[PDB]
Amino acid sequence: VPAFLFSGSTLSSYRPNITIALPHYVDLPGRSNFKLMYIMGFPIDTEMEKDSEYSNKIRQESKISKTEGTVSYEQKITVETGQEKDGVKVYRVMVLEGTIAESIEHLDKKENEDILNNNRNRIVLADNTVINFDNISQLKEFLRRSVNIVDHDIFSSNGFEGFNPTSHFPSNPSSDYFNSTGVTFGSGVALGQRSKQDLLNDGVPQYIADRLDGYYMLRGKEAYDKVRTAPLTLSDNEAHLLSNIYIDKFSHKIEGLFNDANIGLRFSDLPLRTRTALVSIGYQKGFKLSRTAPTVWNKVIAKDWNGLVNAFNNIVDGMSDRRKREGALVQKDIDSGLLKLE
């Protein structure tokens, strides 16, 4: 209580200031009610309901779900491990104002295991609210979920974009863009316009990109004929890696449109499921949502979240069930308190 309080190491974006083992008392810069006690050079975060000039007041619990939730991929977090009883809390700081990725890396270290396995783990967010985790594995999963711009498992699921690991040709004559269409893999990754070098630049591993030789730049009948005549089936692992690379790249185009609207939020401030819904509709209808799905985009820019649900539900495209799944993602976030309504 706490066990191994001084074990392991700490990643920190700030440091306090003749080697001293005496307690040192500092304030995190720019934060109210963030007060740290350094002992043995380790940051310790204490809370007490009783008044103290050496401790913080009890912090409010976050509404974010420890099982299903995320933190913005653009925000810094503080990760802590510790104990709490009866209006007194003592937590060793493992990560002080670090990135999600730095945190994932740091919390994977073996020297940290003992301290993380044997104490209560929590995240202290930028807003000074906290998320309390059942165990370290759950926290790690929360962080991994939070680095993603969209939820890839949802996006590639049957109800939305679908996933085919075998080279396929989405089109034909009567087209519907026959000679425009090209060999496609996983969830919509199309090679008609892309060289191997393009895939390499986007970070596709050499082994995958070499596998794709002969499918690059093929279009129309040559592409159909190639798919039918000499298909290639990637393993689910490689096809997902390829797909997620291109899904992320696309999602950044959507992110850029939304951020350029300058509405007082950044794309990263929207919860995961909502970001996923917007990327899903963009991927199917074309990325400029102001032109391609105006009812949706107007609700987004207005920050009217219930209205956005309704706009998804009201789209009549011949795709409508997928439009409704997208809306239901948004509704789930509203119900989770992640979209605050006026």
Structure tokens, 226: 């190639």
Task: Check whether residue 236 and residue 315 sit in a common domain.
Answer: yes
Task: Check whether residue 63 and residue 112 sit in a common domain.
Answer: yes
From 94, 112, 147, give the residue that closes a domain: 147
User: Distances from the Cα of 341 to the Cαs of 128, 258, 259, in angstroms?
Assistant: 21, 19, 20
From 118, 147, 176, give the residue that closes a domain: 147
From 147, 174, 206, give the residue that closes a domain: 147
Task: Check whether residue 92 and residue 201 sit in a common domain.
Answer: no
Task: Check whether residue 295 and residue 175 sit in a common domain.
Answer: yes
Q: Strand pairing of 35-39 and 42-48? A: antiparallel
Task: Check whether residue 175 and residue 124 sit in a common domain.
Answer: no
Task: Check whether residue 18 and residue 153 sit in a common domain.
Answer: no
Give the residue numbers spanning the domain of 24. 1-147
Task: Check whether residue 169 and residue 299 sit in a common domain.
Answer: yes
- Declared resolution, Å: 2.0
Rounded CA-CA distance 285/149 in Å is 19
Resolved by: X-ray
What domain count does the chain have? 2
List the CATH number of the domain containing 279. Answer: 1.10.530.40
Task: Check whether residue 18 and residue 94 sit in a common domain.
Answer: yes
